[PDB]
Design a binder for this molecule. Structure first.
Ligand SMILES: [Mg+2]
Ligand SMILES: [Mg+2]
Ligand SMILES: [Mg+2]
Ligand SMILES: [Mg+2]
Ligand SMILES: [Mg+2]
Ligand SMILES: [Mg+2]
Ligand SMILES: [Mg+2]
Ligand SMILES: [Mg+2]
Ligand SMILES: [Mg+2]
Ligand SMILES: [Mg+2]
Ligand SMILES: [Mg+2]
Ligand SMILES: [Mg+2]
Ligand SMILES: [Mg+2]
Ligand SMILES: [Mg+2]
Ligand SMILES: [Mg+2]
Ligand SMILES: [Mg+2]
Ligand SMILES: [Mg+2]
Ligand SMILES: [Mg+2]
Ligand SMILES: [Mg+2]
Ligand SMILES: [Mg+2]
Ligand SMILES: [Mg+2]
Ligand SMILES: [Mg+2]
Ligand SMILES: [Mg+2]
Ligand SMILES: [Mg+2]
Ligand SMILES: [Mg+2]
Ligand SMILES: [Mg+2]
Ligand SMILES: [Mg+2]
Ligand SMILES: [Mg+2]
Ligand SMILES: [Mg+2]
Ligand SMILES: [Mg+2]
Ligand SMILES: [Mg+2]
Ligand SMILES: [Mg+2]
Ligand SMILES: [Mg+2]
Ligand SMILES: [Zn+2]
Lengths: 116, 110, 142, 154, 101, 47, 53
RNA sequence: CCGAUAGUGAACCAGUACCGUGAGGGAAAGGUGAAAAGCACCCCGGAAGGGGAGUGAAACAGUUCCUGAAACCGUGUGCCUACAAGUAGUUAGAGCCCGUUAAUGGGUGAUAGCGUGCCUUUUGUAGAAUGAACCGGCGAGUUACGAUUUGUUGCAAGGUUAA
RNA sequence: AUACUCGGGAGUCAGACUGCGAGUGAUAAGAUCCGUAGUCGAAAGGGAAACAGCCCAGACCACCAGUUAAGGUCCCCAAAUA
RNA sequence: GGUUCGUGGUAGGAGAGCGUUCUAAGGGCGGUGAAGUCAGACCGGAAGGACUGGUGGAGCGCUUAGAAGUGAGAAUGCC
């Protein structure tokens, strides 16, 4: 029996074109450039899931560095202080204290100064 | 309510018809007709008949007031192309598209 | 998730007046670039502009260590053939000190649209006087 | 295939210079009305397993009908004349209700005609009892006379 | 008052009545979860752990055992005919925080 | 006839080459790159 | 000599920003009560505005 | 076995049209509706075409008239856009607009970080090497008979028939 | 914690650079030809501005967690104006 | 059922599968709307599969098995 190409090709290409929604011009209309755009969007998204974790740790560190310099510590001294003090609060949490309750952050920086 | 008129499959490339239809879109029908009368294009007399048909339809089928009518919509859609050939140099034949237009005009009371 | 992100206008941009008298051109510049980018605030958000306005006064007295006054050359190209002009840092400190500090600091700001906004927050003066008294600027120490 | 399709023969245009893809026949398989590349060729699909396997199979499918109380054995099965009404009445007496293979062997006459116009029901002499025919039928109705004939072969 | 607790190899700031998503805990929809690992306690009289504030628990009730919105993980190497699509839905537990102690 | 289960291992699914790179037999369809053994009807005679 | 790349829809549309007609310079008449080109004779009245021809 | 690019070259006035001095080459092109009930009449228009009215289950079934995808062409408008250097996304992300197969939702995207299409061929290609204007269809390890090896099943010092 | 033997199925027979040891060359070549180790090829990630072949190091998937390698810590740009 | 060691990959070997047309058997859907087509924020580790609504107006799934003209983005491919 003969099997004509019917429906499966259209169904597969239309899914890919839909994943390219929002892309500039031909990249959201045409299967061939849509398919490349979607492949590349996934590649970037895989890479950026690793880069996002690095990005946020750099943002926290910058904010802790700021909050610690208002206490006459640098980030390098404060984090050394906390390690010696035994405090295990991570950078995402310190960065949040350094924005939301600076009183608490100053208490931790006090503990740090004491350990040094 | 609003009145429609369409001239389907007019020999007149859509681009050439759109450049004129763009002048009337949203005007009062009185003014629109004057714009078509003093716009010296091949599209002008064709678009005028569609627009005057729309106004007749609006006056006879829907008893609307022809003194209070604005062109609500006016657009040109591509009709089926007549495919032709022009013999060029070196025995070669280059394609000619004798394009057609669907001219739609919609008048609305306000 | 939960990391704070400054919104435009949220963080209070303050006005600082910095006396440049006898500080290395860099050394002055690197500190100011930090104040402009708002790197000294825990509210620092890399995509916003949480930084302060900076007025530099006495830029004619900025310091140039070694032979930089005669040997540090600032280049401009018009984009016409052979259209390369040069000025010495010393000549430029004497005549266009405003321009010397602006060049110096413009190189230590991010090279993007936000970096171009930051540079608009910098006000350099050859002498000791500015006309920004209305912004009630606070003295800042390096 | 490309040899059997009408025409082709000539190169459609010269190998080089025209700026077109090289082509050897308007009936090459990538052309619209061109030859198919492989595709069906008339062949037989028939094959037999060894005789002892084919016997084991018929014995096994029979034993499976007995294991499921699907085999009914009639003393005899005869109709004075072809009458499908009479045959349908017969099946209601046996309580068949489903598809059923009827296996007779001489003596029984007018049975084939009586049951020819019933949709589920198939009638065969005892000589023709095949695995596929028994597999295609829920119940197996066989006369005693037939049973002897089937045991004579197996 | 708010606490910093170590769950799922991560730390989160919790206030009473807050809803948090964490890495999948053992629990049924209603079960009370306890957090023995409390790094810090906030408000008046701050308590700093060294590490963990001795005898400090955060008690939460389990609101939902779920899998996150579908992610597609796709990798390819140009010119090497290599592609690998893989779906992912990270399990989570929704908690409502009862009380810091 | 609606629950035929042929003997386990008695039948396998044939390998189809040149149907995509996911299968591992896409493109060159197991022949590798170029030379006489990559060509249709290619292959030196037996010995 | 020839286009290196096809022109995109956006780019083609930007080039045509200026390819358009201007409205005719016309006003209503006094006599006719109808529209006419300034400095032309009005054919509805069959004359030059109100000045008879 | 095919189901209108398939199946004959040819479902249709096809070896036709068309091409060629000639031998010869050789297409494209199926579908209103159950029934013509195939749109009286009115209206704009020279007509074409249309809008009503009417027929019909449907006319967005209106004499090339089942369905009617994509490219491509338009109209409308929610978000953005005229200091910007862009493989066009991706991650972070305000603001504004929405509200779903209701779930750590949808649209848009100021601004920030990161980021050299796809394929082929190569020691090595973003490649200033090859191929593709776009979209759609079609388009490449098959079958026969032998050989060999693995698996399965039957029987077993036997096994098996061919015509 | 592999090895060997027997079978079924391959692909490969253009290699590249770096270090070390040689030849050819001019003790030239991103040269050529061997030996030997590595990486690339067929390896993404971090560093070396960018940079197959160098330094660090091997990506099963998710995380707005942590520690380290090379390389870094005045600003661009995370960390010492130690 | 658990511990331990693993899980970059081209040519290539091995395995398990998705989907297409057709057949058989069984069991179903469908003018209270089949296939197709359009849309969507659903489901599965992938190939892929549903559900709902529009269009459409008569056929089509599912299960087990079988058989293949069985899957296209590239051929200066053909139309
Ligand atoms: Mg880390
Ligand atoms: Mg001529
Ligand atoms: Mg021939
Ligand atoms: Mg060309
Ligand atoms: Mg044919
Ligand atoms: Mg297989
Ligand atoms: Mg294989
Ligand atoms: Mg392979
Ligand atoms: Mg390929
Ligand atoms: Mg090849
Ligand atoms: Mg070779
Ligand atoms: Mg080979
Ligand atoms: Mg045909
Ligand atoms: Mg068709
Ligand atoms: Mg139609
Ligand atoms: Mg500017
Ligand atoms: Mg602007
Ligand atoms: Mg180029
Ligand atoms: Mg080309
Ligand atoms: Mg064999
Ligand atoms: Mg060399
Ligand atoms: Mg060597
Ligand atoms: Mg190679
Ligand atoms: Mg690498
Ligand atoms: Mg780099
Ligand atoms: Mg490469
Ligand atoms: Mg560390
Ligand atoms: Mg820094
Ligand atoms: Mg690994
Ligand atoms: Mg692997
Ligand atoms: Mg079908
Ligand atoms: Mg095929
Ligand atoms: Mg194509
Ligand atoms: Zn007048």
């Amino acid at each position: 029996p003969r099997v004509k190409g019917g429906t499966v090709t259209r169904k597969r290409r239309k899914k890919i074109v839909k994943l390219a929604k929002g892309y500039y011009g031909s990249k959201h209309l045409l299967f061939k450039v849509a398919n490349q755009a979607v492949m590349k969007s996934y590649q970037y998204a895989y890479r950026d899931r690793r880069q996002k974790k690095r990005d946020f740790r750099r943002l926290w560190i910058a904010r802790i560095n700021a909050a610690a310099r208002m206490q006459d510590l640098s980030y390098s001294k404060l984090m050394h202080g906390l390690k010696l003090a035994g405090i295990d609060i991570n950078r995402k949490m310190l960065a949040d204290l350094a924005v939301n309750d600076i009183a608490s952050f100053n208490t931790l920086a006090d503990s740090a100064k004491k350990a040094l | 309510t609003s009145a429609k008129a369409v001239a389907k499959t007019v020999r007149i490339a859509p681009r050439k018809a759109r450049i004129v239809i763009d002048l009337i879109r949203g005007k009062q029908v009185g003014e629109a007709i004057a714009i078509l009368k003093y716009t010296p294009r091949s599209a002008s007399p064709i678009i005028e008949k569609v627009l005057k048909s729309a106004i007749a339809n609006a006056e006879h089928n829907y008893d609307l007031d022809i003194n209070n009518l604005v062109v609500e919509e006016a657009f040109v859609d591509e009709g089926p192309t007549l495919k032709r050939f022009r013999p060029r140099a070196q025995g070669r034949a280059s394609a000619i598209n004798k394009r057609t237009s669907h001219i739609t005009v919609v008048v609305s009371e306000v | 998730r939960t990391t704070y992100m400054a919104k435009p206008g949220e963080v209070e941009r303050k006005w600082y007046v910095i006396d440049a008298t006898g500080v290395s051109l860099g050394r002055l510049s690197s500190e100011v670039a930090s104040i402009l980018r708002g790197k000294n605030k825990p509210q620092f958000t890399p995509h916003i502009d949480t930084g302060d306005f900076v007025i530099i006064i006495n830029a004619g007295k900025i310091g140039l260590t070694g032979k930089k006054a005669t040997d540090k050359i600032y280049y401009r190209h018009s984009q016409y053939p052979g259209g390369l002009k040069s000025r010495t840092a010393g000549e430029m400190r004497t005549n266009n000190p405003e321009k010397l500090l602006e060049l110096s600091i413009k190189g230590m700001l991010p090279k993007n649209s936000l970096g171009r906004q930051l540079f608009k927050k910098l006000h350099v003066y050859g002498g000791s006087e500015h006309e920004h008294a209305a912004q009630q600027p606070e003295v800042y120490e390096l | 295939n490309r040899s059997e399709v009408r025409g082709g023969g000539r190169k459609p245009w010269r190998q080089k210079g025209t700026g077109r893809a090289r082509q050897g026949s308007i009936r090459s398989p990538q052309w619209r009305g061109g030859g198919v590349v492989f595709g069906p060729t008339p062949r037989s699909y028939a094959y037999k397993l060894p005789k002892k396997v084919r016997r084991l199979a018929i014995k096994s499918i029979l034993s499976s009908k007995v294991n499921e109380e699907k085999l009914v054995v009639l003393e005899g099965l005869t109709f004075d004349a072809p009458k499908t009404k009479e045959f349908a009445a017969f099946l209601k007496n046996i309580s068949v209700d489903t598809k059923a293979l009827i296996v007779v062997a001489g003596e029984s006459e007018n049975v084939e005609l009586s049951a020819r116009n019933l949709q589920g029901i198939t009638v065969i002499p005892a000589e023709s009892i095949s695995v596929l025919e028994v597999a295609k039928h829920d119940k197996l109705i066989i006369t005693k006379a037939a049973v002897e004939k089937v045991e004579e072969v197996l | 008052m708010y606490a910093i607790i170590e769950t799922g190899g991560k730390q989160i700031k919790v206030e009473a009545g807050q809803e948090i998503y964490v890495e999948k805990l053992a629990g049924e929809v209603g079960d009370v979860v306890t957090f023995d690992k409390v790094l810090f306690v906030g408000g008046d009289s701050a308590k700093v752990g060294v590490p963990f504030v001795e005898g400090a628990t955060v008690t939460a009730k389990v609101e939902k055992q779920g899998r996150a919105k579908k992610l597609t993980v796709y990798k390819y190497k140009p010119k090497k005919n290599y592609h690998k699509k893989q779906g992912h839905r990270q399990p989570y537990t929704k908690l409502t925080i009862d009380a810091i102690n | 006839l609606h629950e035929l289960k042929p003997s386990e291992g008695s039948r396998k699914e044939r390998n189809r080459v040149g149907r995509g790179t996911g299968s591992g037999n896409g493109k060159t369809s197991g022949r590798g790159h170029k030379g006489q053994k990559a060509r249709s009807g290619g292959g030196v005679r037996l010995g | 000599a020839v286009p290196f790349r096809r022109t995109s829809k956006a780019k083609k549309r930007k080039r045509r920003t200026h390819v358009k007609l201007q409205l005719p310079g016309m006003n209503e008449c006094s006599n006719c009560g109808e529209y006419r080109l300034s400095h032309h004779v009005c054919p509805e009245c069959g004359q030059y505005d109100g000045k008879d021809v």
